[PDB]
Amino acid sequence: AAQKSFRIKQKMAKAKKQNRPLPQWIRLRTNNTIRYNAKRRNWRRTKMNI
Amino acid sequence: ANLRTQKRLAASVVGVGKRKVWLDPNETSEIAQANSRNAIRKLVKNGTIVKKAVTVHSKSRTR
Amino acid sequence: QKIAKTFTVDVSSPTENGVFDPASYAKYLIDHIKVEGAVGNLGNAVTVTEDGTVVTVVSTAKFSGKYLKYLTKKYLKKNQLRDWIRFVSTKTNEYRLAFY
Amino acid sequence: AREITDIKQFLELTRRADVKTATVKINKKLNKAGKPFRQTKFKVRGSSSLYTLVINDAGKAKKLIQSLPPTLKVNRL
RNA sequence: GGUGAACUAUGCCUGAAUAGGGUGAAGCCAGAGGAAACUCUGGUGGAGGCUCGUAGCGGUUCUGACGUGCAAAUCGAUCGU
RNA sequence: CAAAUGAGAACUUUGAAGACUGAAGUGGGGAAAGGUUCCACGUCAACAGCAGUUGGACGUGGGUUAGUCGAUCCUAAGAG
RNA sequence: UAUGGAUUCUUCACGGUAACGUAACUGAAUGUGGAGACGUCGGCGCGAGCCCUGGGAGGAGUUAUCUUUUCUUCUUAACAGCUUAUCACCCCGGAAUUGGUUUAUCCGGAGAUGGGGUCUUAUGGCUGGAAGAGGCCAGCACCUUUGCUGGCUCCGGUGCGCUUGUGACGGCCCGUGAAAAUCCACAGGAAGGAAUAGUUUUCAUGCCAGGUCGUACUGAUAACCGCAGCAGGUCUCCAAGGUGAACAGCCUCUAGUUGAUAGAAUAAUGUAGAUAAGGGAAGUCGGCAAAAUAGAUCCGUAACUUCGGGAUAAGGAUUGGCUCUAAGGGUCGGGUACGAUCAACUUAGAACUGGUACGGACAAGGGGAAUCUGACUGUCUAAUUAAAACAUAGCAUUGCGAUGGUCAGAAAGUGAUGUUGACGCAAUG
16 A cells, blocks of 8 residues: 555565575585575565565 | 667657657667657657657538 | 738749749639639639749738648649648748748 | 735835845737737745736836846846 | 454444436416306426436346356346346 | 567567547546555566567666645544 | 834724724633534536637648548646625615516515615636746757757637536425534733833734655556456546437547467357248247337327326337428617627428338337235345245334333443433334
8 A cells, every 4th residue: 555654664675675585605605505595475476464 | 679668758758648659660779779758858859759640530520 | 801911922942943833823822712602702802912932812801821721732732742842831921832 | 926016116125125036027918919019027036925016118117127226136037 | 262243244433426318296377167166277396215227236037158167156148226 | 561679479669550448448546455566777497378589577776755745633433 | 033014192993874894903811602514306507627619820631523621739727916796784765556586486564676885705807926837830050968049829609518616595304414623703801001112923024944654556357355467356536529318339539458379171069149931839837038019209098096006008100311491599779669790409390302211220118918925115045045035114012100121241339222211212913
């Protein structure tokens, strides 16, 4: 909704920042098994439902 | 090329619909470089982009 | 009531180009301008004067620049001079025939 | 936004000490179809308002533009 | 021992929406007939949980389509209002 | 239909046609809801039940400016 | 927070007969009033925008032939001043031969008509804003930042038009259609002030500041919910031309799309549309499905009836085009009975005409005679039953006079009816 609240916009911002793929450099760390971001979100696939 | 942005911009700049905006099929490169409202204004002033005339709806039979 | 509206047409450019006959164009004007609804009933109401290069139509009855442009367009379409000459008003009632 | 009718109210408005700009607009209009006169609008810009004095006489406009002190910033346009 | 009235049921509070026609209620104006009482006629007017019928709301029939569907209830015509 | 783009075009872009929605629209805005889907650039592995050079996809970014619009204030059914 | 203006040796203003007017023109406690603040429908009036339309100033289209032609631009915001109003109100005067007057019938000795005024500013007009903007044209200088230079942007008309707003009214109800914050005003007359000065910041001008949060986009045959880019569902504003009664259907303008896996062929059976000689329900549980009817005008219309209906009953006829005819209106006066200009669409006739066709597509009732049943309008089994079921008005019965009836609560210094009182509440048929 266009007329949001500040809490809703803060949640928007947090989810926006979290929605990003794995940095190319962390994949090269020693003893590192994390290959990709397993918590990725699309606005169509999964709703934040807040 | 892909001049969807340019067609939308030309409609917005010159005040008619995308159905009336005419883009020159021989200046595709120039229109492609034009990526601002100022450049689209340059184009419409240069005649590269031309407002199509309004489709006629005569009232003669009605009159 | 007897206000004389004067519409001047500059034919200098087509005359110099050599593809226009101002005398014939003016003659077409007198013999095709219709007054009250019928042609030739210009009972000394409108006159066309030719100086060779600028044709002037003076009028006391109902006459308009839109009428004059319509007549000129009809003549250039009859003579197949369209797509070559434009009828453009430089000033109010100061029309001309442009070539380039 | 406020229109001034009298020269005396115009000249007591000029010396109000809150005026910084005075714009003069030259207009062409029609008194008779054969006599298009010139109109002058002196737009004095106060803090709250824009006053516009109107003059249809070229001579009166000239005398007003002369009597206006040169200290005020006059934009002629 | 807890969670639900975002569907739906029912109140309440505050908002919004609903072409064009048919009929012609009370009230009012004039006229005719008549001894009278009164009776009659023509207008006007614009009532109704009135009526034909869009939007809307619903869902009669085809027991039509579909029926491993568009859809765990939809689609089309025909319908109720 | 043609041209351009491209390794590749039924599907992209441009032009020319032919159409449709037909102002209780397939138009222009909004409410709830969504949450960045908006816009540009690059790009086609997967997705768009054919294709794809296109995309609401993928990657990187940019973008939402108020004394006057709204909340904020008031009270309603009510909650407490 | 200061200056001007206003107000004083009659300290807190004048004018108007009055309605009331003005630039101001003290005003505490206390009290009161108003605005906020209100339903719906109908017709009428006014305005805005849109539609339509004439001349003129530009641009575009057609031009075998015709058309002064077809399409398009000619715009004015918030805000300031002046002015403009139906309704109301004042003054004079005193009315039946009652008069005024609305589309609608109400008003007048509680003072009508008439004459003269006052007011509200919805609304409109002029000016300022503001042509300097916007738009339409023409031209100039060109890997040029890109601009600049000339013109124009004018004047009308109409309406049962559409939509919206407004006003004065009328109808409806056993229904009479929020509250509060806020703002103003009045009543009263506490306090204070005047002759070298004061009173207001409800007159004008002037100075300062205005924080926080939202704001992109979709809003749906792809941005929401249905497991999905699902034929489903989901609130609302704006709304051009023609036909037509019509935000019907059908065709167009502005705007928007051209998105639904495609190519070839045209077998059977399908799904959706149709047409059929003669018969005309013989089909079938049953006329299911389909057909027939259908708009408008005129004519005619039965039984029955709760007199309102039935009723569009039943049943007939007409309908095009073209050329005419007729009727229906608004704006000025003789020295204080004769005429002139224009929009505009309704209705009724007359010829003529044609492959007797004409609501020519679209759109668009089949009807009648009965029986059973429910009075009706309305409601329900979302997703197999819309019904004769439920509701209903009407009728009747029952309880209860408040320390009460009916019903809640584990209790309660607790509750619903109840902001109620037998013309009420409660419980039933």
